Design a protein around this ligand. Structure first.
Ligand SMILES: CCOC(=O)c1csc(NC2CC2)n1
Lengths: 300, 237
């Protein structure tokens, strides 16, 4: 169980850690988060009390180093940093636990929610989508745009998701125009799975990361990517049976986690109605269709 | 974007454009089977691809053999339309290729866009105009060449005959659309108007009769009367 200490909390902020959150008052004696489960990526995220604009945060994996948060009064945000001096870090942390100044990652033992949302998410892949190679952790905020959004402007601050475009030469074989547009299996299995992602695990990892970015930071460009990756599978007549079963589980837990008041903006009506009721895979997503129908029947 | 009454003179500027109408591509007769069920029999169709500035009509005849053994023919017809339009553009010299293609039905947008991916600088546009190009098969010579075809074939016409010698392309298109609107609203009466006088003939190399300027005003007036009327006989006004 690892720890992300905070130097201090000089500004009032709501702090998130994965799907949990808590309020820290201005100058409250808060010194970080302990008992973070090893073996998963994590995200620590913030919404300042004064300015609800710019939600931002950090993806990290405690196995990759000792990380801490420090408020920067010049740039005006809580910054993640790496502490290279291992003994300095352990000593700092032990002092803060002894004075009980840390919140405990509050995982219920029955609860697999976080695993189910990050099953295929790896730090190494996050770092290729979010390019900042000098750091082991990845910053994301609400405003960051994706590579594809920039094709339709600062490249250093972009989300380099895999570009998916259904009316593109990559997507459409010469001479198979109707075939490839109405049944995207070629684009899914050959172009994307075999060619670009290499396996379905990496595909699902990017899909899960896009969803999480979209939910936690309100990244519109991540939502775009999440829905595009769902739609590419549902619009394929030929999908490996194991991918379909796994997709149903992935989406089920994503829909389970979306709090009732945020789905009106997140759920793209067209994609979901097409996927659940018109597409080749309309009958292959039983768990996802049952939760969608009981939790969000208006959208449909 | 979409073509409408606000930007109607754009049709007659000097950027090459084509209208594509697919409403006569997949044509069927519906009939009863010996068992009392219903079946369709396809008949020959055509893509109506028209330069509105010059009158040049690229009439791609769709022979019924193109449907043999195929499923979902109404869907296929839109993609067949897009395949043939794309093939036509690729066959034209670069300086003859259109800068825009306007489809008369919005369901042609995605099929054409996909087939034209190699031509990213050709704009594919819908229109809000309810153009009467479906009536093209009421033009006897066009109907004749379509029904007689025994194989796929492209036939080139000028749908304005020699009008551009005397009138502008805006006026020629307006006359064309009035004639076609009349033929669509009441084909028999429209055709009666066009041919009542046996001394006005259709030249062998023309589609419409050889009307003088004055006779065209009478004719156009009779077509507007017909269209007006039918709109009464239809809505009782
Ligand atoms: C857990 C709370 O959910 C949100 O905060 C939320 C979900 S999608 C979103 N915003 C989309 C970019 C448009 N904001």
């Amino acid at each position: 169980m690892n720890t992300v200490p905070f130097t201090s909390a000089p500004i009032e902020v709501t702090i998130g850690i994965d799907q949990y959150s808590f309020n820290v008052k201005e100058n409250q004696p808060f010194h970080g988060i302990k008992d973070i489960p090893i073996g998963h990526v994590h995200v620590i995220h913030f919404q300042h009390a004064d300015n609800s604009s710019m939600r931002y945060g950090y993806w990290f994996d405690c196995r990759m180093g000792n990380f801490y948060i420090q408020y920067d009064p010049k740039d005006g945000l809580y910054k993640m940093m790496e502490e290279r001096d291992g003994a300095k870090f352990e000593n700092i942390v032990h002092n803060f636990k002894e004075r009980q100044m840390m919140v405990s990652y509050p995982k219920i033992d029955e609860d697999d929610t976080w695993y189910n949302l990050t099953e295929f998410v790896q730090m190494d892949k996050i770092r290729k989508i979010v390019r900042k190679d000098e750091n082991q952790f990845s910053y994301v905020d609400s405003s960051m745009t994706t590579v594809q959004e920039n094709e339709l402007s600062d490249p250093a601050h972009s989300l380099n998701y895999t570009v998916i475009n259904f009316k593109s030469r990559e997507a459409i074989r010469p001479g198979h125009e109707m075939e490839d547009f109405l049944d995207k299996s070629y684009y899914l299995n050959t172009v994307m799975l075999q060619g670009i992602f290499k396996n379905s695990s990496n595909y699902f990892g990017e899909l899960q990361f896009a969803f999480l970015n979209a939910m936690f930071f309100g990244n519109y460009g991540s939502s775009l990517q999440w829905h595009a990756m769902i739609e590419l599978i549902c619009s394929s007549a030929t999908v490996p049976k194991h991918m379909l079963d796994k997709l149903d589980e992935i989406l089920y837990y994503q829909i389970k986690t979306l709090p009732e008041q945020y789905s009106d903006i997140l759920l793209n009506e067209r994609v979901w109605n097409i996927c659940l009721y018109s597409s080749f895979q309309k009958n292959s997503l039983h768990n996802t269709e049952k939760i969608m129908e009981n939790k969000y029947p208006e959208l449909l | 974007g979409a073509m409408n009454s606000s930007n109607y003179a754009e049709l007659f500027n000097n950027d090459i454009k084509l209208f594509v109408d697919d409403t006569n591509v997949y044509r069927v007769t519906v009939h009863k089977t010996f068992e009392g069920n219903v079946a369709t029999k396809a008949i020959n169709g055509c893509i109506f691809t028209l330069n509105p500035k010059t009158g040049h009509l690229f009439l791609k005849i769709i022979h019924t053999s193109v449907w043999a053994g195929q499923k979902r023919l109404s869907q296929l017809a839109k993609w067949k339309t897009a395949e043939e339009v794309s093939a036509l553009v690729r066959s034209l010299p670069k300086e003859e290729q259109p800068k825009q293609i306007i489809v008369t039905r919005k369901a042609m947008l995605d099929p054409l866009e996909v087939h034209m991916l190699d031509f990213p600088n050709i704009a594919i546009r819908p229109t809000e105009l309810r153009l009467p190009f479906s009536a093209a098969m009421s033009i006897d010579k066009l109907s004749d060449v379509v029904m007689k075809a025994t194989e796929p074939q492209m036939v080139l016409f000028n749908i304005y005959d020699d009008w551009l010698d005397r009138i502008s392309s805006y006026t020629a298109f307006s006359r064309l659309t009035l004639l076609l609107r009349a033929l669509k609203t009441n084909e028999e009466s429209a055709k009666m108007i066009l041919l009542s006088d046996p001394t006005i003939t259709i030249k062998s190399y023309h589609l419409w009769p050889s009307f003088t300027d004055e006779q065209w005003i009478t004719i156009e007036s009779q077509m507007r009367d017909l269209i007006l009327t039918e709109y009464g006989r239809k809505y009782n006004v």
